[PDB]
């Protein structure tokens, strides 16, 4: 996970907000899997009681 | 109606400008003279004329 946080202040003060009144926090990542032996993944599909 | 009010979101609001002025003055030239003869000094009654 890559987390980027900028708090209000001179960090967020630019030509679009000279006063730097706002901040933000974001998170991002990459994910993926490679299925090598799909037959070894066994699944049963059924209904369930209330 | 023209107070620089500011909200919690800031933004491009309440921009101002400035001005300056230039002053000037110049100099001028003056003078005058007078003329005399040798006799007007030597033969005059008053030896302190000049």
UniProtKB/Swiss-Prot annotation, chain B:
It comes from the Viruses. It is found in: Virion. Assembles, to form an icosahedral capsid with a T=9 symmetry, about 60 nm in diameter, and consisting of 535 capsid proteins. This is Major capsid protein. It comes from Enterobacteria phage N4. The chain holds residues 102 to 151 of 401 of the full protein.
